[PDB]
Assembly symmetry: C2
Homo-oligomer: 152 residues x 2
């Protein structure tokens, strides 16, 4: 039963590194990523310039599910796909669940619980890929909610 692995964590939590190393050590897995698609369709404009519009986001979402479906419908060599996004939004996670249940695939979770102080340190050294402190703060809160930790 092919797997759909969702990485869960704020930017800077180690998701991309894990995904890259996992695929290298586990033949048969492929990566699917929202940031890659957003940058691609805009021909690699400066990250800060990307405007999260309903039109673009819908296109990016469409690319993710169609790619997942095309790959998962592969041969026996295909073991699964990795959705290397933050996946902090409950609605997005539910989408992948209903998607997998519809085609007989198994959804797994790869959690990257990293301390706030550490996330800030890493985020402060990513330049163009860095995220504004307020946005990071908000994603960290969503992560705590996912973990079932208390939040204000």
């Amino acid at each position: 039963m092919k797997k759909i692995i969702l990485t869960i964590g704020c930017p800077g939590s180690g998701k991309s590194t894990w995904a890259r190393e996992f695929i290298a050590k586990n033949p048969g897995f492929y990566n699917i990523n929202r940031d890659d698609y957003r940058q691609s369709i805009m021909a690699h404009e400066e990250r800060d310039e990307y405007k999260y519009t309903k039109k673009k986001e819908g296109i990016v979402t469409g690319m993710q599910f169609d790619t997942a479906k095309s790959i998962l419908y592969g041969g026996d060599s295909v073991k699964g796909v990795i959705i290397s996004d933050t996946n902090l939004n409950p609605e997005r996670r539910l989408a992948w669940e209903t998607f997998a249940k519809e085609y007989g695939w198994k959804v797994e979770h790869k959690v990257f619980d990293v301390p706030w102080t550490e996330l800030v340190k890493r985020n402060s050294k990513r330049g163009t890929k860095a995220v504004p402190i307020d946005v990071l703060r908000s994603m960290y809160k969503s992560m705590r909610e996912y973990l079932g930790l208390p939040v204000y």
Copy 2:
């Protein structure tokens, strides 16, 4: 009539820059690129590590046509898509032509004819994105054939 713009040229010919600036000045256009997809599915492994296998290339091709179709089937705001690849291979160009003729779309060509000496200079300053001299040489020959220029 929505358009499918194919960029034609060797790496270093200015394709990506043109695509980025064109999309910024022409609302309604979106970028589709083989290199972006190849890097994405492999979780951004080192470029030199990518092995052009039949399995991976087929997946990447599938992502291109499905994305093009999903985007082009958009609203009236969608003016077209840009296939920012080298497109030096006659068979790939024919594929996009039959594809467009099948769904009532128009294919256009954006040629980047750059002198060999210049291509070498630019390629020598791209590091990780640089291409081995022998491969560049071969793509330059294919470009000349496309232009209808004599080759040995």
